Symmetry: C3
Subunit: 442 residues, 3 copies
């Protein structure tokens, strides 16, 4: 990793990250076979088996009041919530195909002689179909034989404990779908075991290196996917799991951090703040800007981003890290007439905007307070310090390793006359700030 402190704008850019981009969704349809449990009855009073049977029938009946479909410029603000909404739209759209009675029987037909099969739906979409039959097999082969004419308080406690082991997964699947109205927020271990997740990732329509990274880091696949209830069909619970396809890996990414750049003359301030902070990743000849926090996530040098969360930006947008004052690109900034003191942590350090009214210092976990910082924008290396403080507020630096570089330059905010600085601006092109000053003076 290589981090550049951009002195002219009180910002950093950290390069050397490797992309892991979610480019598609792989659909794994499940049929969890429960078995013939309605036709089982316990009439000999309270029992361990009766308790497990009553839980199982109550969970199966509860599943029918759950339904996932039919009833039973500020760049960051433009992209906010898009990927999350896009994920639900995609999942609900294919669930509409799967929910058809004919599509379900076709799924069950593909699973008659095996526990896994690749299937194509009526809309031409290819999915993986998986059967889960232990509970049905236990009910048919073992439990029903032991309840000869409705006597469940049998001396075999192994049978009662076996029942509670075999129905645990089905009960959790019902809990997770009933609590979330049919759309789970993630892929639990009851929707998809480790073996099933490894089997589904291996079947994804992408290349070997992508599948190897997803297999070796499948807890992240778990975290980025979700499950949708399709419905109950006979004694089978049918749901689908949307698995993220990380189809592009190891392309260049970089992150931009920024803090308020304030310059003062005669007690008055001119301040600006870069509004292009966040992650950038390249793919197939274009650069995508991911302006919102929840949309990208690092694991070491790799950054996991949802492509549906980004905005395609021009290549020239990188000149905001180069010649922000003179560039022809409309570099986005906000402005203020009064300073904000704060800390913007970087991958390899911290940006410290320390202005009049606060005290700032850097600290060591072994040695304590190292030094007080001077007023202005300061760049602290995580080799220089372990913590940075604004007054008493502690900011713990990362310990990520990499080379830091200072790209010298007079802060653009220093060129402003505070007496002529415009009204506070929010997410405006920087040349519109200059245009405001130049027009108001003419």
């Amino acid at each position: 990793l290589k981090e550049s402190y951009l002195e002219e704008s009180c910002s950093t850019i950290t390069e050397g990250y490797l992309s892991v981009l979610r480019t598609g969704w792989y659909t794994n349809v499940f049929t969890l076979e429960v078995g013939d449990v309605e036709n089982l009855t316990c009439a000999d009073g309270p029992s361990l088996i009766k308790t497990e049977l009553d839980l199982t029938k109550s969970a199966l009946r509860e599943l029918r009041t759950v339904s996932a479909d039919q009833l039973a410029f500020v760049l960051g603000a433009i992209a906010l919530g898009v990927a999350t909404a896009a994920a639900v739209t995609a999942g609900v759209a294919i669930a509409k195909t799967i929910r058809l009675e004919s599509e379900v029987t076709a799924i069950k037909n593909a699973l008659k002689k095996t526990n896994e099969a690749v299937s194509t739906l009526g809309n031409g979409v290819r999915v993986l179909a998986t059967a889960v039959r232990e509970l049905k097999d236990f009910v048919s082969k073992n439990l029903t034989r032991a309840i000869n004419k409705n006597k469940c308080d049998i001396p075999d406690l192994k049978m009662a404990v076996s029942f509670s082991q075999f129905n645990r997964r089905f009960l959790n699947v019902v809990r997770q779908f009933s609590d979330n109205a049919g759309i789970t927020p993630a892929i639990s271990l009851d929707l998809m075991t480790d073996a099933e997740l490894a089997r589904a990732v291996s079947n994804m329509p992408t290349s070997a290196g992508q599948i190897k990274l997803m297999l070796e880091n499948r807890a992240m696949v778990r975290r980025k996917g979700f499950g949708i209830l399709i419905g109950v069909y006979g004694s089978s619970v049918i749901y689908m799991v949307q698995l993220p396809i990380f189809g592009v890996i190891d392309t260049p990414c970089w992150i931009v951090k920024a803090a308020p750049s304030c310059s003062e003359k005669k007690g008055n301030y001119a301040c600006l703040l870069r509004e292009d902070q966040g992650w950038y990743c390249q793919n197939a000849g274009s650069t995508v800007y991911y302006p919102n926090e929840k949309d990208c996530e690092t694991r070491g040098d790799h950054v996991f981003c949802d492509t549906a969360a980004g905005i395609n930006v021009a290549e020239q947008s990188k000149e905001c890290n180069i010649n922000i004052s003179t560039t022809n690109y409309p570099c986005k900034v906000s402005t203020g007439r009064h300073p904000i003191s704060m800390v913007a942590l970087s991958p390899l350090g911290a940006l410290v905007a320390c202005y009049k009214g606060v005290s700032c210092s850097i600290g060591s976990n072994r040695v304590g307070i190292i030094k007080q910082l001077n007023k202005g924008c300061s760049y602290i290396t995580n080799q220089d310090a372990d913590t940075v403080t604004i007054d008493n507020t502690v900011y713990q630096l990362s310990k990520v390793e990499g080379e830091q570089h200072v790209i010298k330059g007079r802060p653009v905010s220093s060129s402003f006359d505070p007496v002529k600085f415009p009204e506070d601006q929010f997410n405006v092109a920087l040349d519109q700030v200059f245009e405001s000053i130049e027009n108001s003076q003419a």
Copy 2:
């Protein structure tokens, strides 16, 4: 459903939705009876029963370090987080009444001879009271008799397994309240079973059709409610569940989507974006605008909205979908001098803002890439395509069925001279953009 593409503003409006509005809260107070478990002791070493007894006493003691109260213009930004905060304020306010010692004894008195009773609190609020006594009954009638003088390693394993079945609900109730500091985020199956949820909804102060919809879709009632711990009173755990009352159903709702409308002349751009996107629902003679995402949620043609999340808007606000340029209503927009290419998915299609610098196409799940899109704002029907792409970013269209209509009109952005277009604006009335151009030229 009927979707109109508004060519003059690069936006859509989809009508035909049916409201499900949360209008009130129904309070269900629970007394979970644990029984006399403190006066039980296991002195014969490690045991299955001892393990279950130690879990139960540890969970009961842990519940006393949990407390829910006392210690032991940009329309979207104005409404953000209001409903969530309002829900907690309402729940904490009535929990203040219920937490009184006199109010608790009155609740316990109403439940002496039955497991459910309608009760009125000292503040005149009517609640449902529910008793849960299995664990107390098992402890009193069964477990205590088997521990004759502190010997728990008894040959009866049925007793140990029965204990672990009977205490499971109480342990989960303690887990859910301890992890969330007394205020659960939703209504779990341990706070309220399917039968208890069906009983509470049936007792709600609303009409039959509302109760029928809530009963048949009670997983959504689960998802929109939450639970508050009241405290431990003797051997009884007392909590309350706030259940959403969907008191208004099947009134007209509609959703507005929008994408940047950009017009270019001689390499310069004038762009605007509608800032009135989101859900609108009518009720009792007024129109409520729900500007934030998490506040409404669809299930087919029905949309579930929290009324505390909306802003009452004038009826005339709908003319932004009709005569946005000439209307007297202050239609909210943002502006830019440079284009943003993006996709805004609609219920029945997609708005594609495709401008210089990116490539856009529409695809089919059977046939592949259908066609490249021309530069400008395009409306794609979900009958025309299955996916829309900006460069490599895929947006999956919905498969919702309904009639699409194009309402022709010259884009308002085409009327602007880019050389005279104002500084970037955020959530301003559209006539203030024209006023800025007209004033700056005078």
Copy 3:
């Protein structure tokens, strides 16, 4: 608590709150000993013990595809998400030290003869180390002896049920880390029991009163901390729990609420809205402003705030509650030319902005609709009413007790000529609104 209604700005300030500020993180490292389970085999077919053994080995193997690090001006917008990101950076930074093989052996060495030990890491940071050995002890001392040559279908069901009791905690630890990709969102009862949480809080580097408050309210410590997986080392699962250190308590805090202040003349409106809403707390000679919702949380008179979420503001910023029009502090506001009717709930009442187009009233839970409100900004006491409504939207008031006071003053919005009121402003200093009017007229 003492609440002041500020008539000149349609806002309230509520004083008398006591701070509970998260000032640091205490790290509790765990080694959960699983035991020699790989070298156990069941070859006699299906068994209860085999099922528990297969779950345990599958959970142990699944834990190796989980990794938390390396792969296997608008004040509110500036501070949004800072504390959450800072918490993860701090936790990942110390996990980098703990993940070293030498650091792990040192932790295991400190725990050889005891279940708890204070240890200092190579980076000079002091942590608490905790061992959890029941599952290993059960596997070594009890389970392995019962499987004499791979026969697990033994007549001892006590052994099978004991196994399922002893492995429950380890299975849940694996579930919570696998679902969240190694970084749990909170501290569950399986990461840290009540006794371990009480032991860790008692060891925190803070004063007695802070530890007593944290001990007596440790469910909030649970809610504000989280856990990070370090890895699997032999048969030991190693994770760390970041516990919030509430190192400052009972210093003054106050909250500011606001609603649109609109004045109309001849059918035209001039409106402003205070944009300094939120929590303020004092500490060590400075005032910190917490502009975002999720960053502070009340429990009675105490408010729990994360210090990493705030912005250090000048003491003079409080004059926005005193002389907002004449003060030299740049009091932040937004503006509009058209009114927004809404309700801003206060700790001891409600601000009601009731303008043309809507109807507003206050209600009682015993008596019903009390009275219709007049147009303008109204302050309702929670002693006056139980609910406030805008049209049909109900806002339930709190029942918090305290003294209310009206600080009389002509609304600043009344001083504006609507015909000369500027374009809509977002988060601008109030004197810049006056400057816009005065400059545009010159």
